[PDB]
Design a protein around this ligand. Structure first.
Ligand SMILES: [Ca+2]
Ligand SMILES: [Zn+2]
Length: 386
């Protein structure tokens, strides 16, 4: 039975868009339907966040915060000075004013969304010593996000998240293939990358970098510009955080809060080869991953990064070993789900035979009951003792 009434908040990874974007084709549900709607229809109040898909987890966390409580995104004076982009971003009305009145939320996060959710909790609870000290040094104002003390988040659930990074970023032509992946997802949503679209469709929300697709500019042409831009070449990027070294850097400061439940779901869609330790894409994996990404993930090793035979099982995008929780440079703990969910520790909820895009319904999989998956999850989150 239900032990809390906290609303659920959905949070995408390095692709993702708002419910009004992509002509209403939902990131959360894809070709299968509308997950937020399934949850709301079953009495589990649910919202969707949309943040910069290519931006750093820091930027995304500041965006999520302003998107949740309202106001103008503030990336911090220290951060903005360090990386050379605007301090202030777009303005939001505020999804959940109940939060500033003492409410809480469950965050369900897919892929890189799981890093963002963790970082948001870390900032909400502890703030940033670097931002606090900078503000005191320069006597500039400070966003409450950097002060600490917020109890907004009852739980965080990560699904197929690269807590320890993905070796996908180490591919020789990663840059071109990463943006081909963006185009494959567009295509899955019946949007072409070579059309000179004049209206919005997919906002990458790069306000801070002053970057935006021009009207009549195709996503092909736009992505070529993004490739050469600071959101691809700087350390303040999704690209860096997604890497094994970048993920560990994140892990060294983004820790589990003892006041928060953490759930993780892992994914695999591979088989192990015969005379090799390599892993290979299963029948049914989304075609782009099976052809472009999975062979590399299931065979790439790297001694300096500690990428060995345990890293080869994957879901087409992320190595499965990375998903149960942060471990590289992390003080967080992970325990197998044993029927009772515990605060302040990663509860490994199991591994599912579902690839990176199938789990959100963006690629079909008739044998996967995606409705039941998310309904069972919502039920578990509602049972959490406040
Ligand atoms: Ca499939
Ligand atoms: Zn930034």
């Amino acid at each position: 039975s239900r032990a809390n009434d906290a609303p659920i908040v959905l949070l995408h990874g390095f692709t993702g868009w708002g419910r009004e974007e992509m002509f209403g084709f939902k990131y959360w549900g894809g070709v299968r339907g509308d997950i937020e709607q399934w949850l709301n229809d079953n009495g589990y109040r649910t919202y969707t966040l949309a943040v910069g898909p290519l931006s750093s987890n820091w930027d995304r966390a500041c965006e999520a915060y302003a998107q949740l409580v309202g106001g103008t995104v503030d990336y911090g004076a220290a951060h903005a000075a360090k990386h050379g982009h605007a301090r202030f971003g777009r303005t939001y009305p505020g999804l959940l004013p109940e939060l500033k009145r003492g409410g809480r939320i469950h965050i369900i996060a897919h892929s890189q969304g799981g890093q963002t959710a963790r970082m948001l909790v870390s900032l909400l609870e502890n703030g940033s010593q670097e931002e606090r000290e900078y503000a005191k040094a320069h006597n500039v104002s400070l966003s409450p996000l950097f002060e600490g003390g917020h109890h907004f988040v009852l739980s965080v659930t990560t699904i197929a998240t690269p807590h320890d990074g993905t070796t996908l970023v180490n591919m020789v032509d990663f840059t071109d293939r990463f943006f081909d992946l963006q185009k494959a997802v567009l295509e899955a949503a019946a949007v072409a990358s070579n059309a000179p679209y004049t209206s919005e469709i997919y906002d990458f929300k790069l306000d801070q970098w002053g970057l935006r697709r021009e009207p009549g500019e195709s996503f092909d042409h736009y992505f070529e510009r993004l490739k050469r831009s600071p959101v691809w070449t700087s350390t303040d990027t999704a690209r860096y955080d997604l890497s094994v070294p970048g993920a560990e850097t994140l892990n060294r400061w983004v820790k589990a809060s003892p006041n928060t439940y953490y759930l993780s779901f892992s994914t695999e869609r591979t088989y192990r080869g015969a005379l090799t330790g390599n892993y290979y894409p299963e029948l049914g994996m989304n075609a782009f991953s099976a052809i472009v990404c999975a062979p590399f993930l299931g065979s790439y090793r790297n001694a300096a990064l500690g990428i060995d035979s345990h890293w080869l099982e994957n879901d087409g995008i992320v190595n499965t070993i990375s998903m149960n929780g942060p471990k590289r440079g992390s003080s967080d703990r992970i325990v197998p789900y044993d029927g009772a969910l515990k605060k302040g520790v990663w509860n490994d909820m199991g591994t599912y035979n579902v690839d990176h895009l199938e789990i959100i319904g963006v690629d079909p999989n008739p044998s996967f009951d995606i409705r039941a998956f998310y309904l069972r999850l919502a039920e578990q989150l509602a049972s959490l003792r406040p």
